[PDB]
Design a protein around this nucleic acid. Structure first.
Ligand SMILES: [Mg+2]
Ligand SMILES: [Mg+2]
Ligand SMILES: [Mg+2]
Ligand SMILES: [Mg+2]
Ligand SMILES: [Mg+2]
Ligand SMILES: [Mg+2]
Ligand SMILES: [Mg+2]
Ligand SMILES: [Mg+2]
Ligand SMILES: [Mg+2]
Ligand SMILES: [Mg+2]
Ligand SMILES: [Mg+2]
Ligand SMILES: [Mg+2]
Ligand SMILES: [Mg+2]
Ligand SMILES: [Mg+2]
Ligand SMILES: [Mg+2]
Ligand SMILES: [Mg+2]
Ligand SMILES: [Mg+2]
Ligand SMILES: [Mg+2]
Ligand SMILES: [Mg+2]
Ligand SMILES: [Mg+2]
Ligand SMILES: [Mg+2]
Ligand SMILES: [Mg+2]
Ligand SMILES: [Mg+2]
Ligand SMILES: [Mg+2]
Ligand SMILES: [Mg+2]
Ligand SMILES: [Mg+2]
Ligand SMILES: [Mg+2]
Ligand SMILES: [Mg+2]
Lengths: 187, 90, 75, 64, 145, 68, 46, 141, 70
RNA sequence: AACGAGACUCUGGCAUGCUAACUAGUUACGCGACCCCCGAGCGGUCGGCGUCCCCCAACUUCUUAGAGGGACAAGUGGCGUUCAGCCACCCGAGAUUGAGCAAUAACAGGUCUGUGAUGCCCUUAGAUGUCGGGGCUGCACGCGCGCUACACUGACUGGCUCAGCGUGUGCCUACCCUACGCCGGCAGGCGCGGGUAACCCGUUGAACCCCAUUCGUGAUGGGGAUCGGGGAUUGCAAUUAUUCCCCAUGAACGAGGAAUUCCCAGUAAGUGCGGGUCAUAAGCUUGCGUUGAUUAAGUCCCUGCCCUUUGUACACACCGCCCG
């Protein structure tokens, strides 16, 4: 056991990544196992250094948004903790693999740039894939829980779940495939 | 309550839609000749020629007849178009 | 805006549904019971605590912000 | 009207084209026959060597 | 649990029966929330039962406290009307006593045409606020002739 | 960054080598002391940059001749 | 007032108020027509 | 075990439950009709708030033996929301902080030390550490 | 509060590496230092980051007040 | 050859090396004292907690602040006409910290209301050189810098635990920061000490945050405008309410059209705290810390800037000139 690390509870070493394009850009196994999603981490000092950042910490940073959350990070860690604890119930599966699935199945593998409304189609770099997937599924949650009785942990959990199996009931998937159809038309 | 003998409109049909929100790369519009499954019209497909302001063509709450081009009969993606209509169809 | 109707205390039908919903769920939070039933939410909390006092449910994590339960830690 | 996905590996970065200099010119292999090669235009920050994904390997974009 | 009547009509206003009793009786004018907690505390009532869970005799115990606060030992610095200008009494005006006491106060002011009476008349701001860029109810005017 | 030595750093380092060539070896920390002894550089920051160009020029002069 | 002396007969109800409180220092406003600078659109003369 | 060995919240709950188990420690008459500071907006929920407040006060005296009322009102200060203007830091109530320290001297737990201020008597510290051990043994700490 | 968790977390491990290095052999502390520095740096090397100083013109260090042209 | 750039001056980051400290400390024990067994033990001894009291003990890690040291594209590998230099990497406290200072030539820029700097003009005893009152706050309306919000990533009520830059008795002038006791629900009042300041306020018990309770999608306990009544402090004087406290009243506002501002790392934003003005007194501004992201490593498209070539009927210079 002491050679191996957990977010208190969840194991990393049983994870798998099936998109060989994203194996360089999602950090979860091995030297990227940390006990908490909270490190000082001067990541945003050089260009690609953001790729080394453990994926759960990236999921936390992208969550404290819209003004009256800027900076409040300990709330974000206590949100993520609860979200995973709910996910393990709603499935009975490992929470980290579900997160890795919901990131892989949300990166739009083609987008349309603007040239002149005249657009053109282009393919997205493997880093932008994950950078967009994170944004999308954290906006889905923040949006689903703005005036409902549900709690942000509940909505983030069911968002990760409904996305890890592309279901058209999740904001992320809808927006991704809708961003791809617009590219498909003006190919 | 359903209007017609098929709940999902077929390709090449002209439909009555009430535009509801002008999107960033289209508009999210209701469906009023079929039940209210959403529709998305691409902004490249309002008119055949250059436009000065979108509010002069479409604005929230205006019944209009548009032609569907493609649809994922499974997932629910109704792709809609307005360049491709004659006023007789209307 | 609409009128999300909710009760503050149970009627017999709803009380039956509570003592029978326990196995149906693998996620028991105040919010989900307050939405699947027509419960205010300050009532869902009290009812869930009452059930927990009957060993009918198992508390998996309680926080100041969010509470959770589980089905039976069985099956 | 039906084509499988293709996976290419970036082998060289040429320049940053587009009107605001947003997209990037890049030359890719094909990971099943490393003989093939095309020039593509990507949107994110490509490095070198990472696996793109093409939804229509037949095109070959030539400017902005 | 407890499926008897909930709504109650305390004096001249419909107190909804659902809300917690503290936040239930606040639907009376002149009775904010800080005063209500004191009334309920001096009434010995539980503070975890809604308005529907009180019988017909506790409610009188609460009313008589709201009406005669000075005698149930609620100090003279809680009452909203103090050394009343016309007769020196101290009390909480409750429901229409509030309306009439505001009405009488504005009449009292206008009668001797004090600078506040005229401001209440002309419909302006009575305290010392600037009025050049505020309030601003009316309609736009054009420079054309 | 920059790192383009100014002409007041590329003229000291040229006179010094002409006068004292047999002291200026090939490491930087000894040159940083020789230069401090021979000339009067009125700063630490300037002294180091001068003694850092001296080493470049020394490495180059252990090949063919330089034209200054 | 600032220029006139305004008479005031004293009533008993004036008790405890201030004297100046019965003699206002200005005419109440009623507006004219907006002038040539009134709106951000209004400015132009050839 | 001393007091620093145990979780400083359940210790407070234990000390309050013990203080309100002796019949001593007279409480002021206005205990139920008081805001508790200039910046609050409501009266405390817990009907026994005086007992909790005295418990925490004694604990705070234990950890820093020279308080006086002018810091009990700072130890208890908070943030005032000035309506439509920015908030600002605001002190506690002098009068209840004073009556709390006076009520503790009646239990011989507190005494006015040299210079000026207050500290716990030798007999007060025992009363504390005893329930500290009680807590550590109940929760197994 | 948080900036003291890292002070503590850095100080104790910077200690177990200097109690070894002084009263144990040298080659035993090279084990500690590499079990440590390979997992997370800044358990031995302090962050050099400190707040930058505000300037006139803006609310903080780099922002500026709004500019109303017309 | 001269100026500007750069160099330079201040500041932030590193020294367990030096200098040396009752106006900073730490460790030790000389201690002793309190307390609990909390562990061996029993309760002392072995130990544990101490901003409890000492030392004419030892020292300078933490604190303070002086002298020097350190970083140079210096080492290694690529690209460079093998030059000037660029890119990645190693060792490292650090391989780009932030400011101040700044040229030639100009502008009909601002300031005669900073000046006992000042030409000319005006008024000069029925004053344009003093006291009492009013005004600069007046409200149909158009705009600018902002503050608080539209809530559940929340509001309320308790509980727990952390800073940094600073100022402080006033020379006419006449006032300073506050400990500790007592009285009052609160603002506040009386009493009696310290401070001309690393000495006292002060170990500056700061807010957000952190932990636990009530509410439940409802303009609701969100929000806190407007208005009634009452109680204090400043001052010669508070009405057109100086400021402050309490009970009460409970509006618009459910993320904002066309447009448009600022911003690259301890930065944006959230959060409070000192300085200035200040008899009383920040929704301002100037600084300080505290929790601390997303996106970029680019381009000349838009708005502008610098250098070369080219065209001109412009030179008050395209906001030009000019035809019927
Ligand atoms: Mg706020
Ligand atoms: Mg800031
Ligand atoms: Mg420097
Ligand atoms: Mg320093
Ligand atoms: Mg000490
Ligand atoms: Mg120095
Ligand atoms: Mg080389
Ligand atoms: Mg290194
Ligand atoms: Mg610099
Ligand atoms: Mg210049
Ligand atoms: Mg002048
Ligand atoms: Mg003059
Ligand atoms: Mg005079
Ligand atoms: Mg005068
Ligand atoms: Mg003015
Ligand atoms: Mg301005
Ligand atoms: Mg609070
Ligand atoms: Mg004023
Ligand atoms: Mg300020
Ligand atoms: Mg002052
Ligand atoms: Mg001030
Ligand atoms: Mg000002
Ligand atoms: Mg140039
Ligand atoms: Mg020419
Ligand atoms: Mg020419
Ligand atoms: Mg000419
Ligand atoms: Mg002209
Ligand atoms: Mg022209």
């Amino acid at each position: 056991t002491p050679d191996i690390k957990l977010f208190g509870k969840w194991s990393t070493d049983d994870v798998q990544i099936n998109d060989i394009s994203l194996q360089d850009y999602i950090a979860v196994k091995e030297k990227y196992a940390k006990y908490l999603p909270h490190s000082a981490g001067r990541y945003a000092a050089k260009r690609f250094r953001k790729a080394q950042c453990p994926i759960v910490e990236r999921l936390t940073n992208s969550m404290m948004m819209h003004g009256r959350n800027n900076g409040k990070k300990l709330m974000t860690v206590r949100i993520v903790k609860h979200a995973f604890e709910i996910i393990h119930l709603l499935t009975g599966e490992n929470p980290l693999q579900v997160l890795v699935n919901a990131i892989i199945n949300s990166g739009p593998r083609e987008d349309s740039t603007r040239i002149g409304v005249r657009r053109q189609a282009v393919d997205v770099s493997p880093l932008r894939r994950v950078n967009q997937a994170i944004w999308l599924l954290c906006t889905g949650a923040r949006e689903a829980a703005f005036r409902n009785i549900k709690t942000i942990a509940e909505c983030l959990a069911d968002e990760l779940i409904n996305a890890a199996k592309g279901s058209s009931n999740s904001y992320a998937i809808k927006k991704k495939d809708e961003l791809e159809r617009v590219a498909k038309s003006n190919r | 309550c359903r209007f017609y003998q098929h709940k999902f409109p077929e390709v090449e049909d002209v439909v009555m839609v009430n535009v509801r929100s002008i999107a960033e790369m289209g508009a999210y519009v209701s469906l009023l000749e079929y039940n209210n499954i959403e529709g998305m019209i691409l902004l490249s497909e309002l008119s055949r020629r250059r436009i000065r302001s979108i509010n002069k063509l479409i604005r929230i709450g205006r019944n209009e007849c548009v032609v569907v081009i493609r649809v994922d009969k499974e997932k629910g993606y109704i792709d809609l178009s307005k360049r491709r209509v004659s006023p007789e169809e209307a | 805006r609409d009128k999300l109707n909710n009760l503050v205390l149970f009627d017999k039908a709803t009380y039956d549904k509570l003592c029978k919903e326990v196995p149906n769920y693998k996620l028991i939070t105040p919010a989900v019971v307050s939405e699947r039933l027509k419960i205010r939410g300050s009532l869902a909390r009290a009812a869930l605590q009452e059930l927990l006092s009957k060993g009918l449910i198992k508390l998996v994590s309680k926080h100041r912000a969010q509470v959770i339960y589980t089905r039976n830690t069985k099956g | 009207r039906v084509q499988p996905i293709k996976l290419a590996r970036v082998t060289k970065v040429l320049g940053r084209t587009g009107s605001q200099g947003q997209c990037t010119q890049v030359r890719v292999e094909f990971m099943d026959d490393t003989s093939r090669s095309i020039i593509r235009n990507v949107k994110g920050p490509v490095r070198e060597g990472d696996v793109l994904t093409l939804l229509e390997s037949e095109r070959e974009a030539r400017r902005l | 649990p407890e499926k008897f009547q909930h709504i109650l009509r305390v004096l001249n206003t419909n107190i909804d029966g659902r809300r917690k009793i503290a936040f239930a009786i606040t639907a009376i004018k002149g009775v904010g929330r800080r005063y209500a907690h004191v009334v309920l505390r001096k009434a010995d009532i539980d503070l975890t039962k809604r308005a529907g869970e009180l019988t017909e005799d506790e409610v009188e115990r609460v009313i008589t406290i709201m009406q005669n606060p000075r005698q149930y030992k609620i100090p003279d610095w809680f009452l909203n009307r103090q050394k009343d200008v016309k007769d020196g009494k101290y009390s909480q005006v409750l429901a229409n006593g509030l309306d009439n006491k505001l009405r009488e106060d504005l009449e009292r002011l206008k009668k001797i045409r004090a600078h506040r009476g005229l401001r209440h008349f002309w419909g302006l701001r009575v305290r010392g606020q600037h009025t050049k860029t505020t309030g601003r109810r009316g309609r736009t005017v054009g420079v054309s002739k | 960054m920059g790192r383009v030595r100014t002409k007041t750093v590329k003229k000291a380092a040229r006179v010094i080598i002409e006068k004292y060539y047999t002291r200026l070896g090939n490491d930087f920390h000894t040159n940083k002391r020789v230069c401090e002894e021979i000339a009067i550089i009125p700063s630490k920051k300037l002294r180091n940059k001068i003694a850092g160009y001296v080493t470049h020029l020394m490495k180059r002069i252990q090949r063919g001749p330089v034209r200054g | 007032n600032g220029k006139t002396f305004n008479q005031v007969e004293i009533k008993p109800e004036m008790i405890g108020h201030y004297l100046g409180e019965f003699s206002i220092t200005y005419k109440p406003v009623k507006h004219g027509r907006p002038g040539i600078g009134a709106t951000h659109s209004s400015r132009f003369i050839p | 075990v001393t007091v620093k060995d145990v979780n400083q919240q359940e210790f407070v709950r234990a000390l309050a439950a013990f203080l309100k188990k002796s019949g001593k420690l007279k409480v002021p008459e206005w205990v139920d009709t008081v805001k508790l500071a200039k910046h609050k907006e409501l009266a405390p929920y817990d009907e026994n708030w005086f007992y909790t407040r005295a418990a925490s006060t004694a604990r705070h005296l234990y950890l820093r033996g020279g308080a006086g009322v002018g810091s009990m009102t700072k130890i208890y200060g908070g943030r005032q929301r000035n309506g439509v203007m920015p908030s600002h830091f605001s002190r506690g109530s002098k009068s209840v902080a004073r009556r709390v320290l006076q009520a503790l001297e009646g239990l011989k737990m507190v005494e006015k030390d040299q210079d000026w201020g207050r500290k716990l008597t030798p007999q007060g510290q025992r009363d504390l550490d005893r329930i500290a051990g009680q807590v550590a043994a109940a929760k197994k700490k | 509060h948080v900036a003291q968790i890292y002070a503590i977390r850095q100080s104790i491990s910077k200690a177990l590496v200097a109690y070894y290095q002084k009263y144990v052999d040298e080659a035993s502390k090279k084990e500690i230092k590499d079990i440590l520095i390979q997992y997370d740096r800044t358990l031995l090397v302090a962050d050099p980051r400190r707040c930058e100083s505000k300037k006139f013109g803006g609310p903080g260090a780099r922002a500026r007040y709004q500019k109303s042209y017309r």
